[PDB]
Design a protein around this ligand. Structure first.
Ligand SMILES: Nc1ncnc2c1ncn2[C@@H]1O[C@H](COP(=O)(O)OP(=O)(O)O)[C@@H](O)[C@H]1O
Lengths: 150, 49, 98, 98, 49
């Protein structure tokens, strides 16, 4: 495998933190959580593709191991379709009306819930939380800068 | 009103006739996508191997 | 003819440019439930069939975007369904704008 | 009874104004930021008049002359034009939101 | 008469989709060949990998 052992040890240590799985295994639905916590930013489509296009019911009746999870993360790191933050900060400007580097939080919540891969109301609230202001607007630039540092 | 109806008849017939031949073009693009999809399936299974 | 076909088929709501038309069904229809309210959550007017929930969502989105107030007015003769329409609008607003 | 209500209620007259008229209308400045992603390489990268700027966007979108009316402060649109631009706008940024 | 205009507008508006479809045949079909060729190379590279 084209992956050093130094970071592999830390990856194994992080994967062993779940525990709640019977033993050294991992569920299909919980695979994305461990894949996104270690690093990278895979999408739902990418997760379903690397997982071999699992069935709807297969996401809760089977479990994988680490020998199969390592190549998944390897491919996600090597092969990816993400992009830098320069394109993200410029994409959110489409919703800016006045053009003063601010956008309404409700519009961002709606765009995140409907447009794209859709997100639950529990996640969008935590995402937009903290950036509350008097005018109810959230600077997309600061939002992207904070999300990139996460 | 009669001129618009007569003019719309040629547009409807032309649009329908043009759309008929355009279906083959759209099908050709879909056929190329389906043919290219075979490579994706081979590449997807290849990555799994 | 369109109104009759929509009423006899189980469709009391019908759009009309910028204002929706409603017909009193005189019977509790199954077009009112939490699942339907969640389905209409964040959906354009031309994305779901005619329904008071769609008009309410459109008005809410317009108010949140243009920052201008709204008014869900209901006009009709006595016994047309204005009270039920207002009830459903308030229910949708309380379930969505919470 | 339904015919007598549709006459006084103005349902028929309320629909013709939306079809023959222009129920849609956006300000010059509001129409730019809300639809510039559709035709980015159309307006010169710099300062430009708000009225003349919208003319270049409409010309690049290949919109029929009978589907908009340029005024002194807003850009009118037929019933159903903004609905198409909204879907095309979301489809363009779909790759960015995902 | 206005009804014919609405129908004519919808019929004339369809020309934009048909006109754009004509240019798409030289762009969508042309771009599809590159995507199909890229998939054929990706599957070959994936199989080789
Ligand atoms: N949309 C509807 N669906 C089901 N029943 C309705 C609806 N609208 C009205 N009704 C029925 O009509 C009856 C009388 O309605 P009413 O309160 O007179 O309406 P309004 O206040 O608009 O005149 C109610 O008992 C109600 O069950």
């Amino acid at each position: 495998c084209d992956f050093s052992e130094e970071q592999t040890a830390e990856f194994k240590e992080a994967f062993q933190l779940f525990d709640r799985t019977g033993d050294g295994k991992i569920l299909y639905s919980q695979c994305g959580d461990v894949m996104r916590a270690l690093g990278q930013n895979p999408t739902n489509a990418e997760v379903m593709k690397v997982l071999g296009n699992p069935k709807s019911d297969e996401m809760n009746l089977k479990t994988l191991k680490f020998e199969q999870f390592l190549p998944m993360m390897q491919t996600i790191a090597k092969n990816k379709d993400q992009g830098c933050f320069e394109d993200y900060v410029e994409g959110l400007r489409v919703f800016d009306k006045e053009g003063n580097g601010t956008v309404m939080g409700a519009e961002i919540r709606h765009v995140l819930v409907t447009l794209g891969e859709k997100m639950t109301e529990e996640e969008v609230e935590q995402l937009v939380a903290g950036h509350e202001d008097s005018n109810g607007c959230i600077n997309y630039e600061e939002l992207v800068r904070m999300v990139l540092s996460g | 009103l009669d001129d618009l109806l007569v003019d719309l008849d040629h547009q409807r017939q032309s649009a329908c006739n043009l759309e008929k031949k355009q279906k083959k073009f759209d099908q050709l693009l879909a056929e190329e996508k389906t043919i290219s999809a075979k490579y994706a399936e081979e590449r997807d299974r290849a990555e799994a191997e | 003819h369109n109104l009759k076909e929509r009423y006899y088929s189980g469709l009391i709501y019908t759009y009309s440019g910028l204002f929706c038309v409603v017909i009193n069904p005189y019977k509790n229809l199954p077009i009112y439930s939490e699942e339907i309210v969640e389905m209409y959550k964040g959906k354009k007017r031309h994305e779901m069939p005619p329904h008071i929930y769609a008009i309410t969502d459109t008005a809410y989105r317009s108010m949140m975007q243009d920052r201008e107030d709204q008014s869900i007015l209901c006009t009709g003769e006595s016994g047309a369904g204005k009270t039920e329409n207002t009830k459903k609008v308030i229910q949708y607003l309380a379930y969505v704008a919470s | 009874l339904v015919l007598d209500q549709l006459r006084c209620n103005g349902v028929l007259e309320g629909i013709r104004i939306c079809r023959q008229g222009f129920p849609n209308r956006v300000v010059f400045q509001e129409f730019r930021q809300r639809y510039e992603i559709l035709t980015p390489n159309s307006i010169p990268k710099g300062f430009m008049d708000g009225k003349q700027a919208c003319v270049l966007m409409i010309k690049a979108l290949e919109l029929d002359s009978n589907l908009y009316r340029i005024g002194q402060s807003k850009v009118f649109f037929r019933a159903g034009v903004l609905a198409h631009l909204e879907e095309e706008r979301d489809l363009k940024i779909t790759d960015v939101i995902i």
